[PDB]
Symmetry: C2
Subunit: 225 residues, 2 copies
Amino acid sequence: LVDSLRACVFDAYGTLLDVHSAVMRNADEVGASAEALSMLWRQRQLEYSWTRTLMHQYADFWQLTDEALTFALRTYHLEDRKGLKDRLMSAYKELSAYPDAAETLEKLKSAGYIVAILSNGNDEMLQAALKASKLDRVLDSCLSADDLKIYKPDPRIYQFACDRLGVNPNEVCFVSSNAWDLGGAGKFGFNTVRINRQGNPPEYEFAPLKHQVNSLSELWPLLAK
Amino acid sequence: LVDSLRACVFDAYGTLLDVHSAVMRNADEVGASAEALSMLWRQRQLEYSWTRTLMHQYADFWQLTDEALTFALRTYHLEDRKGLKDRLMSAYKELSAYPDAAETLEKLKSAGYIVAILSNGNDEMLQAALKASKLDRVLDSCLSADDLKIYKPDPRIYQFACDRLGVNPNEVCFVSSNAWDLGGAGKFGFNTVRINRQGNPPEYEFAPLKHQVNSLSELWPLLAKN
Ligand SMILES: [Cl-]
Ligand SMILES: [Cl-]
């Protein structure tokens, strides 16, 4: 209503964790298609999450990441799909965190916010990435779409966060770099803040943002209690 | 695929209609980003259709096409987005048919099949494209997502086709170039045939295809009746 925020709920893949880094770290082994491969990998991973939910054929996020990567490597006819695939999936398992993630989650946790992740990622892949990047120690809760077998932006995933954290939608500040996820969270009723790193155009305008910043570290002035 | 089939149900955008022609015909006006622009427009159009159904914020396919193009034009920071938008939307309204589309639908209609389209596209945009390409005369029925306000691959849209056409799922041969649409249709229970023109890798393998061909013309030996 007037002084309401109790919880900062973060997206993982694209917001706290850098999805470009799995291919970036291996770009020389991939060759000059690396950027195109990386974009195709990401678009199919997300496509599969959406279409499989619509058609009621769920599989977990690691499996979709794998299928999307296989499809992308095949599309680009790469040499040594197999060794390349192993390296790229290992890099994905421990996806690099954005440089300001750890510090800004610490700062929010110290201001006394419930600090949580809400992610499409299943526990195994998510916990592996959060452990490697040290983000797991600065979280109250990490909530997985794999508990529901239903992906974002179905409202039941945002409802899961509310129910687990014991908060109402208007007591949540929902932070994401993914416009579709901000669209679903905003429609659902979270207060949404976009991390817009590259000044990408607006989308999903029927669910306006509360705020937009260009880095995680700009969340702290904004959310300082 | 044994013929106790009563209906051939076709995807429109990507299968009968060439989604690439809207930018290709205006590539000089767009400049060197034309292909990357074309790919983003298409990807976001489809993204919008999936995510809006998942979050219960339907809008029609023309609106999504417009929003996706506006987004793609801004992403590429294009000069004269206003003029380009008008040109590209007009081109989309009358997308080119693939070369074998009209003739193959006529052969199928001659063999006594119900020949129908089942499309995400709303009637206004789809009818314009169908008329411009003379595909109108080779069709029994044109079914739209806009009737139910629910996009593919949600099973209710495939069920809508069964309902309107008076057929069971297993009496349908469902034809598409879009792997997600074949996945949805196949899981629903239609007999699925992929048009894979460029030999793209397989996807959605939990819903196997009945057949794959590289051209709509190849549907003729697959479906011709005694
Ligand atoms: Cl970025
Ligand atoms: Cl093609």
